[PDB]
């Protein structure tokens, strides 16, 4: 039987489901660890104990417990994002989508879910992997990790709450994967991580963490950085939060065993529902329980890793799209709407720059305003909401994933890189928020390809021509076919720095990426900030 | 006889001059201050003594004793600007063009040389009189002043070097035209005083100062302003200054008697040799006798002054040249030469960003390196020969002047702006400098009129109207002509910040001159320098 699988844990029986006229085999809710449930929360994951019988295979999985968006309550645009199964902690389940008939060795990519480290599902029906394992030709995994409190408390020095939680779930996929995805009809020596926000700055945490280096082949990071200045925190940072998460939970304090203790009997929902609370500034594109630099995950500062070339040297893939910042302005910043044109007064634009650049004095915000002020025109309203959308999106998203590519090229085996420029001709989300932050997603999976999900033609094609290089890449360390003849995907170098927009338009080569504001971003305000 | 006027300092004879087919009358050479020599050196201004008989005015006087420019010997672009007579300590004398036949209370213009306070001559060929007095029907006068140590050595706290007493030359001439230009058919109530560069400095410097603001009515100010960075220094910049030139000359430095005494001993070359070796940076456009802020021509500091409108209220014209800061560069930065299109490599430009901002941090080079370098294109020559042209000319001249006109126009009477962008055709310089420092003051003094000297039919023109925008400004406050049909100059307001281009092209009017760039020299950089 094409749907029994037998694997090192076990026996799995899958599902035959249809895509695009035809059927592949889906392996869905398959468990990696043990239920990190009671005394085994905030702790490491444990392997999953292999079980007699056959597993189960044919339904999505539980999602792990998390803040719910309920800010436009029925909207698509919203709550294509939110978990669409019940939440359980109760999560650690991995998906693969396997083509029929079943491969014997073929390429395999592993998706890790973006949410900002406190939210996220696989099972998204824009993560739906058949449609890319069925047209490319891939084994195409999607793993699950813990987020928010769960995933990320972090009490250095303890080893019942040590951080890092949610890295070493996704991990320990990865190593499920490594063992197992072989009798999948799996590669698992040409293993590719991808991930989109959260899930890029993962697969950047993995390229860089000793202890995840030898566990995949290569990577593909969609808007997303290990760098990123929301993606991480300090021991000191992570231990000030979960006090504070205890504090507004009314745990007793005297001891981490004592803290623990109190934050174990509370139900998640109580923990979920003070989360936000424990920020240190009044932010946007900051979040509560993220990664920490605990020395044994990441061994030094990720700036010192990507300067001495500490990071796994391989082939990746990665970019951004138009509008990074749009979805957080409108979400968190004074004068933004998702039902006007959010023209954005003189006053809101510094109300704006004071919540993107949180951690900035004064002087590092008078540097930010000048640096995005058109002074010919400074009442524009149309130019301070798009001033707003570049501080953001070149900030959080495109001058940290700049910064990395350029650190990594020195030492890596080759880099590409593109500019994801596509408004889709569907989008439910305002004209102002432009090529928003996750909404080249659903290309890289090819929901475009699915006739009731009204995209132009132009648009699955664009989708067809993504997925395929994303996944020629996968198998290759190259996402250019060997002599095609379309117009080829330019290695990113040092000296050149060319990259690709994406989008229904012939493909353009550019060079330099925003290179004007990331000397601002990489190397001018982090000078300014640390001399005042 | 019309070439014989009495005054209060008694009897003085002109002389007939011709002039484009015409003649006026020329009153060349006549003392307004005892000789400051001897233990008069360093000393505030003396009023001239009356004398009996007629004083010889027929001939221009004597120069001021400075540094002469030998850069490019026999070479007329630098030429024209060195002294054309004698140099002497006895030097204070003005010269008077008067229409003919003699006018009965015409408009008053008054010229005050630039030179950086450390030279000029009112006897330059570029300062002939005679074309705007014989064109516009003005009484013209030019004065003198004391420059460098002789003029500016300022021991504050001494009466016998104060400082600022080639400030107080000009304020004797200024009240000799007062108290004496209705006999040579002037009105003392309608004197428009005008300078370029340190003379357009100067006249906002008497714009300011309560003892100079009742001895005219306005004013213009060409590629200068008081507040400009080189133009002053503090009272203790200047004492360091002075006791360095003692040392430099091996005097006795022990109290300011004896210093005073020793530097009055010298010859003016002595003085002259090492004069440039008391500057604190290595720097360009520094200079190093200057107006010193003393609390008495300047009772408090110039920002003060300004913010809170104390200075005279009254009509100005004003405005820069499109390359102010190319003649610097080339005289003073490495990579900048005569006779080579001067491309300037990324270590020379960073080479020069440090001369020209010599007072800034490191953090501050930074800003500036930042603003001014296009990331896209960094090795580009022109470009960073044309930067460093921006900088120079921005921070020196520019930018301290649009502080000037919008602190300014607040509290007075009506402010008119131009930007002077036409490259003469016969200009002798290099291309590659563009529109340079001094080179509007031809077309101010109706050279292009003359046939001779090989101007363009078009640039004749220019210089005409130029000629009377400014001496219908001397005469009403305005420099339009009421109900002509001529496209209008614009007053310059707080609100729409409008100004004029001068070239022979037909007149634009454009708003807010180098906005983002002033905003970086007057907000930013003045704060982030204060802070770190
Ligand atoms: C310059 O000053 C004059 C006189 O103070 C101003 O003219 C006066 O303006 C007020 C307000 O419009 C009138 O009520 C007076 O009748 C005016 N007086 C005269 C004599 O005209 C003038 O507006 C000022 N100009 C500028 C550009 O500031
Ligand atoms: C007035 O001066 C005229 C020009 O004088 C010249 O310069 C002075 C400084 C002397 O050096 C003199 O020898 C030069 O000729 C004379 O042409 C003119 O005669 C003088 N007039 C009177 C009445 O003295
Ligand atoms: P990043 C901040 O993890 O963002 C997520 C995936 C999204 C829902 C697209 C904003
Ligand atoms: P400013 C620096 O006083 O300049 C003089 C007049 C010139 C010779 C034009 C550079
Ligand atoms: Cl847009
Ligand atoms: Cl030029």
Redesign the interface.
Known sequence: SELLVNTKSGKVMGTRVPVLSSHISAFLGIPFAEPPVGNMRFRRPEPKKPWSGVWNASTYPNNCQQYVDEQFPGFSGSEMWNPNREMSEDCLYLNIWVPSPRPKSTTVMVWIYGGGFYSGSSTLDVYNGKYLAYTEEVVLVSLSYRVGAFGFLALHGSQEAPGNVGLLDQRMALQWVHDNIQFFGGDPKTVTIFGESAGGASVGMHILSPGSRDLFRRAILQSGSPNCPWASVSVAEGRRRAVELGRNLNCNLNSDEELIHCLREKKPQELIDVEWNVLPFDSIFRFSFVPVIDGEFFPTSLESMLNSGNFKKTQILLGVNKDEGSFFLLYGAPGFSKDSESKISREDFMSGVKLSVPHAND?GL??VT?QYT???DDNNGIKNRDGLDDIVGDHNVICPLMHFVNKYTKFGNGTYLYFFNHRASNLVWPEWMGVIHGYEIEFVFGLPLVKELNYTAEEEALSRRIMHYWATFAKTGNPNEPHSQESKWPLFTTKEQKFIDLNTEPMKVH??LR??MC??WN??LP??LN??
């Open positions: 002087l008078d540097a000048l058109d002074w010919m060079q330099r290179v004007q000397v601002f190397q001018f000078k300014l001399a005042t």
